[PDB]
């Protein structure tokens, strides 16, 4: 039913009350600081690649794999021999007078075998991920997740991998093909996802039924 209690994926308050801020200090200056947070050094001319645990990176999946395999074999043998007089000389009647030498035979053997296999997959999304840890060589372990609830179900797109902090180009974007340990999941929920499950009996027949 649609009246069953449910928790939206975007939990918590959707509003933030702004803070008034700190009261000015009567130091004679109109300028007033705002409690600086981060004291870390930041380069000016570098490409702003992710560098720490909390840094975020953009991943363009653009995954495309296609593999094919084919094989065939054949073998055909055909033979057919004949011999007959239909008229035998008087002097040769002893050996071929009757159908004693009359011969006829045929034989065939044909075999044909074939085999094939294909496997293709594509992925054309964009997902922003967050650094999980910094490796010894500087490679970043990135993990990210995105949940979308269009209606009557939810989709989860999750990515994980190791990104070398040198393939990041320009606007903090790196193709998924450049990420090591690529783990990509695109799963769904709800009756829409349930309708794509085989069913217990059909699955059992598929895994056990002969032929």
């Amino acid at each position: 039913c649609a009246w069953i209690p449910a928790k939206p994926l975007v939990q918590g308050a959707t509003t933030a009350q702004p803070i008034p801020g700190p009261v000015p200090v009567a130091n004679g200056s109109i300028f007033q600081s705002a409690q600086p947070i981060n004291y870390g050094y930041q380069p000016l001319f570098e490409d702003r690649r992710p560098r720490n645990i909390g840094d975020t990176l953009t991943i363009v999946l653009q995954e495309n794999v296609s593999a094919s395999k084919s094989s065939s074999a054949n073998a055909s043998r055909d033979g057919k021999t004949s011999f007959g007089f239909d008229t035998v000389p008087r002097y040769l009647q002893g050996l071929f007078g009757n159908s004693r030498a009359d011969m006829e035979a045929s034989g065939g053997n044909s075999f044909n075998g074939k085999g094939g296999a294909n496997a293709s997959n594509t992925f054309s999304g964009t997902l922003t991920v967050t650094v999980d840890q910094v490796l010894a060589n500087g490679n970043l372990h990135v993990v990210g997740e995105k949940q979308i609830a269009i209606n009557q179900g939810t989709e989860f797109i999750r990515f994980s991998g190791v990104v070398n902090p040198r393939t990041i180009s320009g606007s903090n974007s790196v193709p998924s093909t450049q990420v090591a340990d690529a783990r990509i999941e695109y799963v769904g929920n709800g009756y829409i996802n349930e309708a794509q499950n085989m069913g217990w009996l059909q699955r059992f027949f598929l895994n056990l039924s002969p032929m």
């Binding site: 380069p43 001319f45 570098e46 490409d47 690649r49 040198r166 180009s169 320009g170």
Partner: protein, 113 residues
């Protein structure tokens, strides 16, 4: 140049013009002296590689000098000096003390009789 920029932290897109005329690819040759020490410096010779017209007031940037074993034995960086009808060679210069040694070759000196 793109490799150096990427190492420094700038990633230029693969498809770009990159038509510059203030840089020249060069080969640097040095003479590893006997009993070379780690902190010592040696002179280097810089020679143009491509189609550069001249290397009058150029600067050599952190080139690793390697031996025949593919090992980095020195680091060379500095300013090129070139001579200012017998015209001087403007595609080849010398840097005095431009290379600092990094590795020391083991020797048997002092052993045996």
């Amino acid at each position: 140049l793109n490799n150096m920029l990427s190492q420094l932290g700038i990633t230029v897109p693969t498809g770009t013009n990159m038509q510059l005329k203030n840089v020249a690819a060069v080969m640097v040759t040095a003479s590893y002296p006997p009993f070379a020490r780690q902190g010592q410096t040696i002179d280097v010779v810089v020679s143009s590689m491509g189609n550069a017209k001249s290397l009058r007031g150029g600067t050599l940037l952190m080139t690793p000098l390697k031996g025949v074993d593919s090992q980095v034995y020195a680091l060379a960086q500095g300013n090129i000096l070139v001579g200012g009808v017998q015209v001087n060679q403007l595609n080849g210069g010398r840097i005095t003390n431009g290379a600092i040694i990094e590795r020391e070759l083991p020797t048997q000196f002092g052993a045996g009789n």
